């Protein structure tokens, strides 16, 4: 019955939008193990851009989140079918291409993002008042 879900991301400056996404992946099936992958500082910088928190800070915050069962930190930047076999992952859960092969296989579970809740935007709140 237990379904293994893998959700990777930068998880920089974790906010409610991030945690609703993790809650969503956790609840994709009735009995799950949610594995979260945290990307490395170097690869995030090289491919995405500026990260505020280090790998260790981003990883420690996630350990406090109710929905997170296991953590791979750091995690590979690109998911491969080897990786899926290595960790016995049944579905990859991410927002939406690079995930075509997963959707083709029956193993992609779309999860949704929440905007405006970002730590970035809460400073703007502090500031559109100054």
Residue 76 CB neighbours (<10 A): 15
The 75-104 site mask, x for binding ligand S3V (CB under 6 A), equals --x---------------------------
Query: Token pair for residue 58?
Result: 């981003």
Interface characters, 56-95, with a copy of itself (x: CB under 8 A)? -x--xx--xxxxx---------------------------
At 12, is the secondary structure helix, strand, or coil?
A: coil
- Does 112 interact with a copy of itself (rule: CB under 8 A)? no
Number of Cβ within a 10 Å radius of residue 36: 26
9 binds ligand S3V (CB under 6 A): yes
Determine, following the binding rule CB under 8 A, whether residue 100 of this chain makes contact with a copy of itself: no
**Torsions phi, psi for 50 (to 5 deg):** -65, 130
Find the part of the chain contacting a copy of itself (CB under 8 A) among 15-23, 35-43, 77-85, 100-108.
15-23
Contact 55, 41 (CB under 8 A): yes
- Contacting residues for 57 by C-beta, under 8 A, at least 6 apart: none
Q: Give the interface with a copy of itself as residue ranges (CB under 8 A).
A: 13, 16, 19-20, 22-23, 52-53, 57, 60-61, 64-68, 117, 119, 122-123, 125-126
């Amino acid at each position: 019955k237990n379904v293994v879900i893998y959700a990777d991301g930068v998880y920089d400056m974790l906010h409610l939008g991030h945690m609703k996404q993790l809650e969503q992946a956790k609840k994709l099936f009735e009995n799950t193990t949610l594995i979260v992958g945290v990307t490395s500082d170097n690869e995030t910088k090289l491919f995405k851009g500026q990260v505020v928190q280090t790998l260790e800070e981003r990883t420690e915050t996630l350990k406090h989140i109710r929905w997170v069962d296991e953590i791979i930190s750091p995690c590979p930047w690109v998911v491969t079918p080897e990786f899926l076999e290595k960790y016995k992952i049944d579905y990859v859960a991410h927002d939406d291409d690079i995930y075509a092969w997963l959707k083709r296989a029956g193993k992609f579970k779309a999860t949704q993002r929440t905007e405006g809740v970002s730590t970035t935007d809460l400073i703007v709140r502090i500031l559109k008042n100054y």
